[PDB]
Design an enzyme around this catalytic site. Structure first.
Site, PDB file in Angstrom:
ATOM      1  N   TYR A  56       2.560   3.640  -8.151  1.00  0.00           N
ATOM      2  CA  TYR A  56       2.568   3.094  -7.088  1.00  0.00           C
ATOM      3  C   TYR A  56       3.547   1.490  -6.818  1.00  0.00           C
ATOM      4  CZ  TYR A  56      -0.975   5.923  -4.917  1.00  0.00           C
ATOM      5  OH  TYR A  56      -1.566   7.168  -4.939  1.00  0.00           O
TER       6      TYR A  56
ATOM      7  N   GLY B 298       6.762  -0.667  -6.214  1.00  0.00           N
ATOM      8  CA  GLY B 298       7.823  -0.217  -5.419  1.00  0.00           C
ATOM      9  C   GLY B 298       7.392   0.891  -4.580  1.00  0.00           C
TER      10      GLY B 298
ATOM     11  N   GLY C 251       5.735   3.397  -3.691  1.00  0.00           N
ATOM     12  CA  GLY C 251       4.273   3.693  -3.250  1.00  0.00           C
ATOM     13  C   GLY C 251       4.391   5.417  -3.733  1.00  0.00           C
TER      14      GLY C 251
ATOM     15  N   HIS D 104      -2.236  -3.923  -4.940  1.00  0.00           N
ATOM     16  CA  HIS D 104      -1.322  -4.236  -4.001  1.00  0.00           C
ATOM     17  C   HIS D 104      -0.618  -4.162  -2.680  1.00  0.00           C
ATOM     18  CE1 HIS D 104       3.444  -6.237  -2.854  1.00  0.00           C
ATOM     19  NE2 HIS D 104       2.619  -6.907  -3.486  1.00  0.00           N
ATOM     20  N   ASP D 105      -0.651  -2.710  -2.602  1.00  0.00           N
ATOM     21  CA  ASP D 105      -0.153  -1.778  -1.462  1.00  0.00           C
ATOM     22  C   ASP D 105      -0.901  -1.769  -0.599  1.00  0.00           C
ATOM     23  OD1 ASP D 105       2.455  -0.470  -1.321  1.00  0.00           O
ATOM     24  OD2 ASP D 105       2.047   0.389  -3.710  1.00  0.00           O
TER      25      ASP D 105
ATOM     26  N   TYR E  57      -1.414  -5.257   1.315  1.00  0.00           N
ATOM     27  CA  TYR E  57      -0.772  -5.007   2.157  1.00  0.00           C
ATOM     28  C   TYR E  57      -1.136  -4.509   2.895  1.00  0.00           C
ATOM     29  CZ  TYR E  57       3.590  -7.298  -0.363  1.00  0.00           C
ATOM     30  OH  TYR E  57       4.222  -8.587  -0.952  1.00  0.00           O
TER      31      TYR E  57
ATOM     32  N   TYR F  63       7.422 -16.829   2.607  1.00  0.00           N
ATOM     33  CA  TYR F  63       6.179 -18.324   2.302  1.00  0.00           C
ATOM     34  C   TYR F  63       6.233 -18.704   1.401  1.00  0.00           C
ATOM     35  CZ  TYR F  63       5.292 -14.129  -0.997  1.00  0.00           C
ATOM     36  OH  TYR F  63       4.493 -13.928  -2.179  1.00  0.00           O
TER      37      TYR F  63
ATOM     38  N   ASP G 298       0.051 -10.788  -3.306  1.00  0.00           N
ATOM     39  CA  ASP G 298       1.149 -10.801  -3.889  1.00  0.00           C
ATOM     40  C   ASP G 298       0.428 -11.876  -5.161  1.00  0.00           C
ATOM     41  OD1 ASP G 298       2.966  -9.482  -2.311  1.00  0.00           O
ATOM     42  OD2 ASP G 298       4.383 -11.035  -2.107  1.00  0.00           O
TER      43      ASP G 298
HETATM   44  C1  LIG Z   1       3.316   6.474   5.331  1.00  0.00           C
HETATM   45  N1  LIG Z   1       3.391   5.081   4.798  1.00  0.00           N
HETATM   46  C2  LIG Z   1       1.971   4.603   5.517  1.00  0.00           C
HETATM   47  C3  LIG Z   1       1.324   5.443   6.807  1.00  0.00           C
HETATM   48  C4  LIG Z   1      -0.132   4.959   7.859  1.00  0.00           C
HETATM   49  C5  LIG Z   1      -0.338   4.168   6.910  1.00  0.00           C
HETATM   50  C6  LIG Z   1      -0.299   4.333   5.791  1.00  0.00           C
HETATM   51  C7  LIG Z   1       0.652   3.617   5.014  1.00  0.00           C
HETATM   52  C8  LIG Z   1       0.960   3.746   3.883  1.00  0.00           C
HETATM   53  C9  LIG Z   1       1.707   1.962   3.736  1.00  0.00           C
HETATM   54  C10 LIG Z   1       1.991   2.055   2.008  1.00  0.00           C
HETATM   55  C11 LIG Z   1       0.932   2.677   1.720  1.00  0.00           C
HETATM   56  C12 LIG Z   1       1.467   3.166   0.251  1.00  0.00           C
HETATM   57  C13 LIG Z   1       2.934   2.679  -0.041  1.00  0.00           C
HETATM   58  C14 LIG Z   1       3.646   2.492   0.459  1.00  0.00           C
HETATM   59  O1  LIG Z   1       4.675   1.552   1.019  1.00  0.00           O
HETATM   60  N2  LIG Z   1       3.423   2.687   1.843  1.00  0.00           N
HETATM   61  C15 LIG Z   1       3.108   4.539   1.818  1.00  0.00           C
HETATM   62  C16 LIG Z   1       2.302   4.963   0.777  1.00  0.00           C
HETATM   63  C17 LIG Z   1       2.640   4.571   2.985  1.00  0.00           C
HETATM   64  C18 LIG Z   1      -0.164   3.413   2.493  1.00  0.00           C
HETATM   65  O2  LIG Z   1      -0.796   2.841   3.121  1.00  0.00           O
HETATM   66  C1  LIG Z   2       3.863  -3.829  -5.726  1.00  0.00           C
HETATM   67  O1  LIG Z   2       5.434  -3.962  -6.549  1.00  0.00           O
HETATM   68  C2  LIG Z   2       6.015  -3.618  -6.332  1.00  0.00           C
HETATM   69  C3  LIG Z   2       7.569  -4.085  -6.302  1.00  0.00           C
HETATM   70  C4  LIG Z   2       8.261  -3.463  -5.761  1.00  0.00           C
HETATM   71  C5  LIG Z   2       8.553  -2.876  -4.315  1.00  0.00           C
HETATM   72  C6  LIG Z   2       9.709  -2.541  -3.810  1.00  0.00           C
HETATM   73  O2  LIG Z   2      10.983  -2.554  -4.088  1.00  0.00           O
HETATM   74  O3  LIG Z   2       9.882  -2.316  -2.654  1.00  0.00           O
HETATM   75  C7  LIG Z   2       7.375  -3.000  -3.833  1.00  0.00           C
HETATM   76  C8  LIG Z   2       5.927  -3.620  -4.174  1.00  0.00           C
END
Ligand SMILES: CN1c2ccccc2[C@]23C[C@H]4[C@H]([C@@H]5C[C@H](O)N4[C@@H](C5)[C@H]12)[C@H]3O
Ligand SMILES: COc1ccc(C(=O)O)cc1
Length: 121
Positions: A27, A29, A31, A47-48, A51, A64, A89
């Site tokens: 997860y 970078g 994800g 963290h993912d 976000y 920020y 973060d």
């Molecule tokens: C496809 N994408 C998505 C498409 C539609 C809704 C949500 C997501 C993501 C965003 C975020 C997270 C993991 C990690 C990665 O940063 N992203 C991927 C998988 C997913 C996952 O929640």
């Molecule tokens: C949650 O840690 C990270 C580290 C790197 C990245 C990235 O390189 O996109 C995203 C989340």
């Protein structure tokens, strides 16, 4: 933004953001997918997710203001999105430090192909 997240990760953990956390486990970078490998891979999972609660901003890009201060991390008067990203973060960076022992070079640069499956936030 990543420029801010990276400084944070360095400040709190002492390790550089990039090889040290940008591809760790399933997860960090990347994800995507899988069952998180360990404590540090689990932080990235949150963290993912963190976000994810925000579809209204650009976590990877919106810059920020935060400052340190004798230890803790302080986010500053931003633009809700900006503030929200910083607490995301902040938490994550804290989580890494929180678990600097379970850090395993065995998972540094852990591919993907071995990461399998669903996991709902
Ligand atoms: C496809 N994408 C998505 C498409 C539609 C809704 C949500 C997501 C993501 C965003 C975020 C997270 C993991 C990690 C990665 O940063 N992203 C991927 C998988 C997913 C996952 O929640
Ligand atoms: C949650 O840690 C990270 C580290 C790197 C990245 C990235 O390189 O996109 C995203 C989340």
């Amino acid at each position: 933004s990543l420029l801010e997240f990276g400084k944070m990760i360095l400040e709190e953990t002492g390790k550089l953001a990039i090889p040290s956390y940008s591809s760790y486990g399933c997860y960090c970078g990347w994800g995507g997918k899988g069952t998180p490998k360990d404590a540090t891979d689990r932080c990235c999972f949150v963290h993912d997710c963190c976000y994810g609660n925000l579809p209204d901003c650009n976590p990877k890009s919106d810059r920020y203001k935060y400052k340190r201060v004798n230890g803790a991390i302080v986010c500053e008067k931003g633009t809700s999105c900006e503030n929200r990203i910083c607490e995301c973060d902040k938490a994550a960076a804290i989580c890494f430090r929180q678990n600097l022992n379970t850090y395993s070079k065995k998972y540094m640069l852990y591919p993907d192909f071995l990461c399998k499956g669903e996991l709902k936030c």
